[PDB]
Amino acid sequence: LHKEPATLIKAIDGDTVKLMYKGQPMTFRLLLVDTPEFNEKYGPEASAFTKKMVENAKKIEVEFDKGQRTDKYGRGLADIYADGKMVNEALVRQGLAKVAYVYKGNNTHEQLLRKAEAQAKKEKLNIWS
Numbered sequence: 101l102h103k104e105p106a107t108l109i110k111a112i113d114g115d116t117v118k119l120m121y122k123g124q125p126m127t128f129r130l131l132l133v134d135t136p137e138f139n140e141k142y143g144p145e146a147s148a149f150t151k152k153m154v155e156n157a158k159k160i161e162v163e164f165d166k167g168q169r170t171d172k173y174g175r176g177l178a179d180i181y182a183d184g185k186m187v188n189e190a191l192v193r194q195g196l197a198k199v200a201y202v203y204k205g206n207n208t209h210e211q212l213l214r215k216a217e218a219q220a221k222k223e224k225l226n227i228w229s
């Protein structure tokens with residue numbers, strides 16, 4: 101899998117970010133995770149966590165997986181990195197997202213994310229408390 105360059109346009113919520121990718125604005129939905137909606141418990145924390153992570157980054161990178169690249173809403177589906185750190189993983193490690201929406205073809209980092217979710221669960225972090 102390849103890391104491609106992109107630049108923050110705007111933080112959206114826990115698992116969606118607007119980025120400029122190949123010179124075009126686009127909404128990215130984070131692969132393999134599900135954060136609570138802003139209106140739900142831990143929703144504001146997950147939005148704040150992703151925000152701080154994408155806004156503090158010197159470098160944002162987008163990585164597509166081996167299946168579908170855009171969903172039925174036209175959102176890009178990707179792993180997002182912030183100065184080398186995967187946002188998808190970091191959210192699950194902190195108990196602010198569940199592993200979810202696992203479809204074959206687009207699950208390269210599945211095991212990694214489950215592994216984070218187990219430690220979060222062990223620590224009773226956030227969603228698991």
Ligand SMILES: Cc1cn([C@H]2C[C@H](OP(=O)(O)O)[C@@H](COP(=O)(O)O)O2)c(=O)[nH]c1=O
Pocket residue numbers: 129130131132133134171172177201203206
């Ligand atoms: C993460 C992800 C979501 N989706 C779609 C399925 C869901 O459809 P429905 O909207 O029909 O339920 C929706 C969930 O996104 P959200 O969690 O952002 O709402 O996005 C994909 O198709 N592939 C993906 O990899």
Ligand SMILES: [Ca+2]
Pocket residue numbers: 115134135136137
């Ligand atoms: Ca969500």
